[PDB]
Amino acid sequence: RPDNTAFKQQRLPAWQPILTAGTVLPIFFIIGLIFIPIGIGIFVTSNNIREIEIDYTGTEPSSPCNKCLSPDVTPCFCTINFTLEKSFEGNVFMYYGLSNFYQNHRRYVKSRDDSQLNGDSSALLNPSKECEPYRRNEDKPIAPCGAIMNSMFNDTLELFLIGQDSYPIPIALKKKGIAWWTDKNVKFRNPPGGDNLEERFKGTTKPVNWLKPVYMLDSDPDNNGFINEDFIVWMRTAALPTFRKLYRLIERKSDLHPTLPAGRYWLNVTYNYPVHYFDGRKRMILSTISWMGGKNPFLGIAYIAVGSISFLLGVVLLVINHKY
């Protein structure tokens, strides 16, 4: 009489998986065969990626350009010698790291007005109440308001190749295409309408620290206003104190030559961005790239430390079980 439905009787069609030792021991020996062929598969593509980080912060009495670690004429000029042992083959990328620069600071991550950079005309002339400390100077609206876009890393690097003679061959750098294409054509747009990138900025001005207006960051109209890669890559926050943001990438020449022939080079940095104050270093990381990304050992030493500690207990299990 009571409902003999499949469910109410509480005996629905089950799977009932029998998880037991005799049927789980292979669970260890099945991975060990599949991680290690990766833990080592990766570890190879890691140590086969050459990099170099030329700490050029200063603070070194023998540092080549300590001369301008202190306040001097704005256009300082460093020059750092360094030698490449194993030439780079592929197309190399040139980062510019940092340290103790807490770009992830709740009081410093809110400091962007994301709806302005997107190009919302009305929002432009009167930015939000979030980029407060750098919102209005001289009672005027700032185009890229907020601390984040304000303290935009503003020193120019350069690399020269020293041939047999003393004349250094200038290495060619590229700047376009260094920011996520997703947030370089969709999330950052110039003001609504205009022809010359200046007019569009009528009531706004430059930030406090900056030296030139945003409509003059570059001549190429495709990169000037709120689209400047240098600017974009500076906005996506650091995600950690010790970070490093893409600066410029050298496209691997079509020919079969090493994009970076070994030897010693010249690195003359127009030192402008001062970080000695908060005890923050600076660097310039040159690097290649493999499908894994940039040189990083962790993924390697991790797999090989898991793909060989699971595949071991199985032994101590397989041997302990039969002996009982």
């Binding site: 009489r1 009571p2 003999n4 109410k8 009787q9 509480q10 005996r11 629905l12 089950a14 009932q16 998986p17 998880l19 030792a21 005799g22 789980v24 991975i31 990766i38 990328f93 790291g97 807490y102 992830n104 600071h105 709740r106 410093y108 991550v109 400091s111 994301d114 709806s115 997107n118 939000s128 400390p133 750098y134 601390a147 303290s151 996520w180 997703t182 969709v186 999330k187 996506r236 926050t237 650091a238 995600a239 950690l240 010790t242 970070f243 893409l246 104050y277 690097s287 790239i289 894994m292 990304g293 940039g294 040189k295 990083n296 962790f298 993924l299 991790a302 797999y303 898991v306 079980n321």
Partner: protein
């Protein structure tokens, strides 16, 4: 103590008949519902954390703490609100039906809500009652009209009530004729079975007939009338005072053992969510000690914030590091753990095995809360007669004057008269086809089978009872002589006394006083010189395992009767303590009875009532038995019941060993310490009495050096099976208490059959009412009910277990789900300037606790059997022992936690080392911090779920759709929310975070691994437990 008048006019001061079963209304719903929620800890705390977000300037927008709190409410209010509205629309029906009244010679047709106290009602057949009437007359004479209380206590037979003699003549004869009466009844008591009243009808000129009343005249409000044409009643209670309506309240039992742990975890978290704040505040104002390490020229403190009183600012932080870690208290537990119970309690009412064919009904769960309290019992107080042995008695081997009749007609003939009288048989009035059956229809309808087997016995001999015809009684004494007997007083039976009696008047002579009852309570009042002659017989018939009952008559002298008669009736009109004041009037009426002969009735065991009790033992319970029959009998049915193996060194405390005041203790301490303290294991069981017991508990205040009771109790815990014979109706309660209150809180599961057991079922942690033959007085109070005893096995093990392992692994996971989700966001308050920068987004702080990972734990809550429901009831070895609440004890709890911490750390530090690379994609680009949220999130939603897919040992088709139905949701949400949802937002901070967190082939290998290294401390216990 009240007063009434039939026509409301003698020779509004009372309640009004509108039954309001609901609790809320159409106006005070919110101000009541909300409060009844926000008084709960976790539903209130989350409120504070809302205000603090609306006034103070805090990291996470108010949405991420007001939505997952406004939702968990709106989904409880609706259910808890609607589920109520069912009553309103239900109620409105009952108290808005048609019920005719009699104003003045008028058969008015009013609404059942309009009735007032003291006014004539009318009722046809098949119709429910308007209110508690007092049957005053029916269409026919005999003033009788059956009733079927099929809605109050679940009874399904046709009981028979009685009208008032002095009024039976009134039927359509204009009873409205200013009919005088005074209906005084004790203020409405919800006992539903006792009713003390009185009537003072007035004749034409003068009359004060004091026609006493009784429960046999009350017609409850809701007992469908049956087998009659119509009646006329006089309302006495008018709704919300009626006996039924008072019985909506039994909530003072739903305090499970898994409802305080849920309150011992929070009290922990609420004391961890501070350390997580204090330890992470101090480190800030100690970190900011550096002068440049704050506002180092690249985030200049907003001028205002600079001029703030330091101490105050030292507050707004500590109030920020709660609003930022508040998620460490599960917000959506007080809806799941309730939605579970509701959606998952019926299972104990549908299981076909809880369905006896005969009773044509199944189990019944009268409490949707104590479910989880079944896989906890540690003491099981069965009842011998009614549960262990169905009530089908067969009179065999009587004994008259110790002659064991098979004397001739000097006293034997009298004896038979005793059997056929002094009872409440009430043979089936209707007449069936007689001539084809054995004798006739002759179907006896009574409640106490202890006698229905007697009558059927005498029916095997000469005499036979077939009467109760018009105040008389008919019998056939081996020939054709109806031999009417005039019944005068039917002294109802009362357990506390163990004797029912009847005072008949010999049709052609003097009076007689028949009576019967247990020997231990009939012998004290006898011509003692006759006891031993028959005592031995009553021993054997008991010694072999038959019920026993003695019967004796005492001729009364007429001159003496009037004293009794007056003394008897006058002992009824007393409205105060009637039953007591009455009980005591005839307790001295059975002064000295001339014993005639004893009787013996046999009983049968149930289907598995001998197999079950062999299971319970193997399950670890300590089954007791609280009988009421003679000691010998219980000791006999016990062996058969199989709770006393062949070799068990009993420790009996019967009257046969303690016939003194001090003797026992001497014997007590002996067989306790020198007998059961110096030491298969079951070698010892106990046996007590209703007298030997009372001496111990009540009289324990003497030897305060080593108190008697404190000694006795000590034996209880160390005896696997104990008995209790000659138990009174209340001593079956003092026992429970005396046990419940010792060495912790042993969860006592009692199980009764009839009225006698109402005194413990209402007292033990979780009653079990067996709806048997006697009645539903037991099954209506019990939390559950099962129309058998063989079911108490499939109930405890096969359900009491799953209804625990289905929650113990919910209140656990429902915490570990969070203490991981909020650990990273605490570490990441180390590699940031302690500026409370929420690691995750905000769209991933509301969702995660209501949408991403809500269902997968509900699914595993309702439908799951970590051990096949067959292998669990077919093997009681430990599966009711492996969980003695251990699933939530301090041992396991802090394992999950020390599993969150690890599985928590590996989430963050597992990622941190992964962002020492300078890039992860192949184009060489970089990854922001938000892309540090989804990683350490997408690696979260894939663990707190999979960690379940390593626990579900019963994969139905739902689980397959929920678990893989949340994951494949998450991986979609981030794809949609990720994309264009700009217009109304203000941040566009996660515009394309996810879609780029997947195009980095070197990222998966971090997820596909960080998952494993987080589960590897779980994939191990499987192996280390499936190996031995």
């Amino acid at each position: 103590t009240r007063t009434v008048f039939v026509g409301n006019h003698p020779v509004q001061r009372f309640c009004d008949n509108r039954i309001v079963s609901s609790k809320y209304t159409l106006w005070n719903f919110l101000p009541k519902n909300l409060f009844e929620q926000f008084r709960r800890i976790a539903n209130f705390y989350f409120l504070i954390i809302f205000l603090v977000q609306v006034t103070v300037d805090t990291p996470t927008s108010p949405v991420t703490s007001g939505l997952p709190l406004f939702f968990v409410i709106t989904v409880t209010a609706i259910k808890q609100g609607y589920e109520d509205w069912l009553r309103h629309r239900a109620d409105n029906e009952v108290n808005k039906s048609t019920v005719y009244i009699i104003e003045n010679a008028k058969r008015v047709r009013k609404e059942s809500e309009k009735i007032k106290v003291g006014d004539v009602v009318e009722v046809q057949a098949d119709e429910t009652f308007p209110c508690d009437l007092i049957l005053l007359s029916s269409c026919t004479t005999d003033g009788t009209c059956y009733v079927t209380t099929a809605s109050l206590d679940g009874e399904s037979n046709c009981k028979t009530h009685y009208a008032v003699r002095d009024t039976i003549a009134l039927c359509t004869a204009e009873s409205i004729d200013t009919l005088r009466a005074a209906i005084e009844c004790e203020q409405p008591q919800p006992d539903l079975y006792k009713f003390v009243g009185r009537i003072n009808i007035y004749s034409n000129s003068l009359e004060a007939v004091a026609r006493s009343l009784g429960p046999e005249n009350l017609l409850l409000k809701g007992a469908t009338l049956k087998n009659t044409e119509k009646i006329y009643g006089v309302a006495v209670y008018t709704g919300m005072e009626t006996k039924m309506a008072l019985n909506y309240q039994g909530k003072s039992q739903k305090r499970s053992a898994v409802e305080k742990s849920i309150n011992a975890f929070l009290i922990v978290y609420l004391f961890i969510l501070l350390t997580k704040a204090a330890v992470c505040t101090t480190l800030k104002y100690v970190w900011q000690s550096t002068p440049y390490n704050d506002e180092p020229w690249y985030n200049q403190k907003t001028q205002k914030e600079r001029e703030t009183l330091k101490v105050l600012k030292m507050f707004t932080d500590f109030l920020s590091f709660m609003v930022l870690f508040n998620f460490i208290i599960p917000v959506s537990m007080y809806v799941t753990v309730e939605m579970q119970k509701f959606l998952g309690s019926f299972f104990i009412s549908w299981d076909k095995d809880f369905y006896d064919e005969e009773i044509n009904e199944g189990a019944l769960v009268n409490t949707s809360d104590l479910n989880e309290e079944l896989g906890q019992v540690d003491y099981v107080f069965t009842d011998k007669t009614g549960t262990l042995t169905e009530n089908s008695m067969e009179f065999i081997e009587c004994c008259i004057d110790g002659h064991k009749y098979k004397v001739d007609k000097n006293r034997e003939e009298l004896f038979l008269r005793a059997l056929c009288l002094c009872h409440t048989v009430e043979i089936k009035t209707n007449d069936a086809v007689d001539g084809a059956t054995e004798s006739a229809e002759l179907t006896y309808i009574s409640s106490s089978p202890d006698e229905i087997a007697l009558v059927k016995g005498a029916k095997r001999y000469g005499f036979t009872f077939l009467g109760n015809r018009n105040g008389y009684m008919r019998v056939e004494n081996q020939r054709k002589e109806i031999e009417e007997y005039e019944l005068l007083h039917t002294l109802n039976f009362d357990a506390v006394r163990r004797r029912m009696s009847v005072i008949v008047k010999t049709q052609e002579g003097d009076i007689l006083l028949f009576c019967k009852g247990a020997d231990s309570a009939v012998f004290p009042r006898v011509q003692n010189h006759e006891i031993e002659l028959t005592k031995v017989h009553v021993e054997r018939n008991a010694m072999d395992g038959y019920r026993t009952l003695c019967v004796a008559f005492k001729e009364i002298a007429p001159d003496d009767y009037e004293r009794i008669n007056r003394q008897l009736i006058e002992a009824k009109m007393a409205l105060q303590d009637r039953e007591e004041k009455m009980e005591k009037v005839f307790d001295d009426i059975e002064t000295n009875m001339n014993l005639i002969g004893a009787t013996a009735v046999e009983d049968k065991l149930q289907d598995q009532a001998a197999e079950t009790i062999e299971a319970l033992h193997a399950a670890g319970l300590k089954v007791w038995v609280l009988t009421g029959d003679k000691m010998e009998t219980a000791k006999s049915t016990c062996y058969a019941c199989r709770l006393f193996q062949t070799n068990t060194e009993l420790l009996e405390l019967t009257t046969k060993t303690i016939e003194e005041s001090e003797r026992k203790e001497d014997r007590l301490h002996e067989l306790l310490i020198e007998y059961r303290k110096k030491l298969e294991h079951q070698e010892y069981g106990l046996i007590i009495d209703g007298s030997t017991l009372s001496l111990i508990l009540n009289s324990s205040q003497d030897s305060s050096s080593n108190n008697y009771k404190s000694i006795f109790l000590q034996i209880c815990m160390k005896c696997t099976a104990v008995l209790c014979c000659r138990m009174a109706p209340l001593q079956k309660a003092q026992i429970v208490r005396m046990v419940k209150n010792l060495k912790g809180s042993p969860i006592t599961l009692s199980i009764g059959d009839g009225a006698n057991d109402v005194s413990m079922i209402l007292e033990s942690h979780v009653g079990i009412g067996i709806k048997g033959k006697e009645g539903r007085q037991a099954a209506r109070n019990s939390d559950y009910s099962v129309p058998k005893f063989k079911h108490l096995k499939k109930l405890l093990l096969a359900h009491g277990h799953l209804y625990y392992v289905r929650i113990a692994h919910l209140v656990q996971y429902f915490f570990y789900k969070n203490l991981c989700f909020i650990l990273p966001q605490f570490l990441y308050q180390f590699f940031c300037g302690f500026s409370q920068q929420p690691l995750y987004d905000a769209a991933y702080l509301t969702m995660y606790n209501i949408c991403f990972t809500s269902l997968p734990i509900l699914a595993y809550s309702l439908l799951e059997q970590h051990i096949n429901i067959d292998t669990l009831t077919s093997d009681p070895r430990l599966y009711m022992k492996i969980s003695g609440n251990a699933m939530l004890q301090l041992g396991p709890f802090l394992y999950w936690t020390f599993l969150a911490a690890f599985e928590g750390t590996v989430f963050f530090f597992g990622t941190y080392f992964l962002f020492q690379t300078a890039s992860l994609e192949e184009n060489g680009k970089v990854y922001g911090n938000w892309t540090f949220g989804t990683i350490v999130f997408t690696v979260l939603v894939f663990t707190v779920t999979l960690k379940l897919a390593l626990d579900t040992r019963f994969w139905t088709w739902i689980n397959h759709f929920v678990i893989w139905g949340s994951l494949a949701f998450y991986v979609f949400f981030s794809f949609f929310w990720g994309g264009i949802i700009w217009p109304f937002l203000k941040q566009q901070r996660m515009y394309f975070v996810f879609a780029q967190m997947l195009s980095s082939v070197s990222t998966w290998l971090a997820i596909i691994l960080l998952i494993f290294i987080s589960l590897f401390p779980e994939i191990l216990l499987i192996v280390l437990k499936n190996v031995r």
